[PDB]
Structure 1
């Protein structure tokens, strides 16, 4: 129900071995851990959740962009990239959060399909 795809705009490649942490907003307004992983060789992270666990709510996808750039010997601007959104059942059922990274910039989009 939830996939993350990360691309590198400097090298023209998937962004491999990027740490990604997903959080769900709790009733007290704290962010609690939900799912995490490292992007694959294809820059993707699948297997984060199941339909059962992925209930409506506010989620945060934190992509560790600073460590990614540092590992490539490149000095970056951001601490991380943050994508915060509401999962809504009246919308399509599969969510892809994509991000396109540069050292001083990033783009993100959502592809929400049925």
Structure 2
């Protein structure tokens, strides 16, 4: 698991479950190539997105569909999605904490 994403709900005080996200890698034409995707588990976590071999240096974007999440809860949200864009350089945990009109994201990088 070189890359894990965890999503939390600041309104309900819970993991944010069934949140869909896509991971993209920046290509040489500066376009975003689909790389991996999935939805968060009951613990708010999404594991197994990639492998050590595949996860090479480059610029990656995690696009978290926060809008669909708030919509399912019947709460009007501000953002279309939450975006985390970063360079991988030679384990990454991306955490996102969601509110309807605000989000925060942090990275925990370990070894």
**RMSD (CA atoms):** 0.2
Q: Give 1:5 shift.
A: 0.2
TM-score of the two chains, using structure 2 as the length reference? 0.99
Matched pairs, number = 110
Q: Give 1:65 shift.
A: 0.2
Unpaired segments ≥5 residues, structure 2: none
Q: Give 1:74 shift.
A: 0.5
Q: Give 1:113 shift.
A: 0.1
CA distance in 2, matches of 1:58, 1:11: 33
CA distance in 2, matches of 1:101, 1:86: 23
Task: Tell me the secondary structure at the aligned position of residue 106 of structure 1.
Answer: strand
Deviations 1:11-36 (A, max 9, x none): 00000000010000000100000000
CA distance in 1, matches of 2:3, 2:35: 12
Q: Does 2:95 correspond to 1:98? A: yes
Q: Give 1:64 shift.
A: 0.2
CA distance in 2, matches of 1:88, 1:47: 19
Unpaired segments ≥5 residues, structure 1: none
Task: Tell me the secondary structure at the aligned position of residue 99 of structure 1.
Answer: strand
Q: Give 1:104 shift.
A: 0.0
Deviations 1:31-73 (A, max 9, x none): 0000000000000000000000000000000000000000001
CA distance in 2, matches of 1:113, 1:20: 22
Where do 4+ consecutive residues of structure 1 move more than 2 Å?
none
TM-score of the two chains, using structure 1 as the length reference? 0.96
Q: Give 1:111 shift.
A: 0.2
Q: Give 1:96 shift.
A: 0.3
